[PDB]
Amino acid sequence: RTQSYTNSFTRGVYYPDKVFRSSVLHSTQDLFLPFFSNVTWFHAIHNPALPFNDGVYFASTEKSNIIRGWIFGTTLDSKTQSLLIVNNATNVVIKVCEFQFCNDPFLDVYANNCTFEYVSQPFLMKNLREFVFKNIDGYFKIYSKHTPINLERDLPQGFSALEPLVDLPIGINITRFQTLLALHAAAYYVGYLQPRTFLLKYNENGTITDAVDCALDPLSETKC
Amino acid sequence: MSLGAENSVAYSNNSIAIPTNFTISVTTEILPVSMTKTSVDCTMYICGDSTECSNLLLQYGSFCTQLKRALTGIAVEQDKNTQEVFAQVKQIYKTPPIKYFGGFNFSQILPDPSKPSKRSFIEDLLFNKVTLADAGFIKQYGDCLGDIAARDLICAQKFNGLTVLPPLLTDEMIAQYTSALLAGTITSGWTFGAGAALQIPFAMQMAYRFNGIGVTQNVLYENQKLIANQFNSAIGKIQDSLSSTASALGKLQDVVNHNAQALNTLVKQLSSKFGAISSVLNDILSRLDKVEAEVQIDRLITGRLQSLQTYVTQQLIRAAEIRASANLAATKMSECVLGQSKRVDF
């Protein structure tokens, strides 16, 4: 695969909890993607495993839904339960099992110590889709957002808050992950979360419209 | 930093410098007098209509009685400060309906009956420049009960037991006292501060004022129009400086700002845990049995009592500073307005 490097451009803020707040500035201390970070743009035409380092911000712009899912885990050659995300465009299968994949994961498109199983609404529905995966205290948390962009050249400028979908109490010592591609090509951005303090602004409608990262530059530390 | 421009005065054994002309300069001095009067209910603040918290707070003695006594003393002291500064004149004097005072224009500082609150033009500019922080002297519980847009800070202060009391003298009463002082100063001179007001023409009064500073009174009568024009131009410059620059009243703004900000801090301390398992009293009373919830409630009671004591001590020190400034303002009103002062730089 081909790697390029891109600025994050103050992007990747999620709702910290399911509590409505309006017209107030709230300070939180969570695993956030830092502002103006160094995200990695991956073009896939050819796959070593990507490290899972305290949460992953995933961004995609695939219109035709080539991108499908992720293989969070440690071994990824059966032999465990690991974690799996498979979309059938009508359901999501987060069954912690295997499919006997090699080093190149793939998906052909034309139960051995099963601990957890979950079926929900479809996951993957100017088409920038952002996800955040984190693992705290044995809990796997996923945040997501859909945003339309004007021109597809890099990550756009602005604030788009991410909303939670799915909480899972399993996954167990996740340290590597691979992303599914199905061929009957890819332009996906990967960034790494860090423990950071943020100051979030809620407007009168309860929406996060602005944020300050309290460790970027001394002006933002003064603001915090 | 630079201390000032370098100057070397030409001293000699037999050389003197004597002025040949003068200017009449009107300057502005801003003095705080009173601050906001507040009252705190401990049972609404610490407990918030909880019976068990009230029964555990009853064992802590008479802390809240002496907090209420201290805040009531501060609230009485503010009205005493305003009465000591402004209400010194005995009778409400009025100006004659013909506004001729030797060529001096007093229309900027004398009231007009156009607006309901009989204030002058400069008083209107001063009242518009200082932005109040929506104190609770106005009734707002009917407004706080009807939820519109978002929750206000003043509504949270009212719901958490923090109340702002209105002052005794309204704005029109202080304006009427000030207008009486202006009418006495223009018409009678310094004679109204020592007994009955004795009238004198303003040219003769200003000749007395010139004779008080060591200048012979023939200087005024031969330069009356120039002195009147200089006074009118200085009043117009104060008008322009008050209409243009909006950072000269900031000391009074500080008297607003702290008296909001500390109150806001006193609400934010209700969001703290102080070592307990929750900052919500009902969650503590619901999650645990009697002994453990009593321990958590004791931790919360100790923390909130400490924050309230810190607020009362800071208010007492601020009230002492405000009383010192009000005593200075009362002395300046008694010495500069009711007479002529020979104290230099006073």
Partner: protein, 366 residues
């Protein structure tokens, strides 16, 4: 309040009035299933410590008084809650973790502890809420020839994070020479049997442990017990019980825009401002019902016993716990006159009161 039998002339801040609540509302979800604690607490056998069994409990009525009828335990030791209050308030999900340990290690199932079980086998988080139930099982998990069916790990390369499980068995090496799958020198298998015997001491007996971890209410609540719901009334100071959180106030229909994953709404002081009804998806604002301060204006006790009452900061169409409306509240028992005197008893924004001859009476003037 003055702690004396005679008062002097003036205004005295006496007390505070509050409108007392009348009715009580309980609002719980309309869920009818019963939780399967019977297949958790008593079974044929319990799993080992390294493969501890986790069962998810949701969408049912949780009765905790039937737990004592299933197992003969002493200590229903809970950390974030109390065992006698588990029926009133209620949660999102329950997780039951079942295993069998030795009697020395029952103290190791606790937040913030190290050792052998809490370090390499089963680690509880430091902020853990829930209860731990342990009871002796010498009559079910012991044999005279030895019970070798329960396994525990000796040591690991790294520590164990809270709520993780290790299944794979790898031969440990503590030297430069690799084991290469051979348990030779400096190569030890991690898993060892307990070897339970009835002749052993009272501290080495098997103990069945079930850890019930409740996660707190942030999502819509799914699992909780038998509290009868009450019909919802509005525009009245009532005592409400919404999903286990209690309070007193007035519930008003609103126009707040909750996102569909949101349930509550907080304040600057972190108290509940808006709530969502669990039966009908409706957003209600909680406001405290009307309250304020009450001051008493009196002359001296040697003069008379007539008083006037100032209710501070209220538009008094809401008087009970001559009527004159001032800017400092409103006055009951003082007759306003169209005169002007010197101020005797100061009240508020330009209004004072006195005790005058015009039959003696309390009058209020400007």
């Amino acid at each position: 309040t003055l702690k004396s039998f005679t008062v002097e002339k003036g205004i005295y801040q006496t007390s505070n009035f509050r409108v007392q609540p009348t009715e009580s509302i309980v609002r719980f979800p309309n869920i009818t299933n019963l939780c399967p604690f019977h297949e958790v607490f008593n079974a044929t056998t319990f799993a080992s410590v390294y493969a501890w069994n986790r069962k998810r409990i949701s969408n049912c009525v949780a009765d905790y008084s039937v737990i004592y009828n299933f197992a003969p335990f002493f200590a229903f030791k809970c950390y974030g809650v109390s065992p006698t209050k588990l029926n009133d308030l209620c949660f999102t999900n329950v997780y039951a973790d079942s295993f069998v340990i030795r009697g020395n290690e029952v103290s190791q199932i606790a937040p913030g502890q190290t050792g052998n079980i809490a370090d390499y086998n089963y680690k509880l988080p430091d902020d853990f809420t829930g209860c731990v139930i342990a009871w002796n099982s010498n009559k079910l998990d012991s044999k005279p020839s030895g019970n070798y069916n329960y396994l525990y790990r000796l040591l690991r390369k790294s520590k164990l994070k809270p709520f993780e499980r290790d299944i794979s068995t790898e031969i440990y090496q503590a030297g430069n020479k690799p084991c290469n799958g051979v348990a030779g020198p400096n190569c030890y298998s991690p898993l060892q049997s307990y070897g339970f015997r009835p002749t052993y001491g009272v501290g080495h007996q098997p103990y069945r442990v079930v850890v019930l971890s409740f996660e707190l209410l942030h999502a819509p609540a799914t699992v909780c017990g038998p509290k009868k719901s009450t019909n919802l009334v509005k525009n009245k100071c009532v005592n409400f019980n919404f999903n286990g959180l209690t309070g007193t106030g007035v519930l008003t229909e609103s126009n707040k825009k909750f996102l569909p994953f949101q349930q509550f709404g907080r304040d600057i002081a972190d108290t509940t401002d808006a709530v969502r009804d669990p039966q009908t998806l409706e957003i209600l604002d909680i406001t405290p019902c009307s309250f304020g301060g009450v001051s008493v204006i009196t002359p001296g006790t040697n003069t008379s016993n007539q008083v006037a009452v100032l209710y501070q900061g209220v538009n008094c169409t809401e008087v009970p716990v001559n009527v004159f409306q001032t800017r400092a509240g409103c006055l009951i028992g003082a007759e306003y006159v169209n005169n002007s005197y010197e101020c005797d008893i100061p009240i508020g924004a330009g209004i004072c009161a006195s005790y005058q001859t015009q039959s003696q009476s309390i009058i209020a003037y400007t």
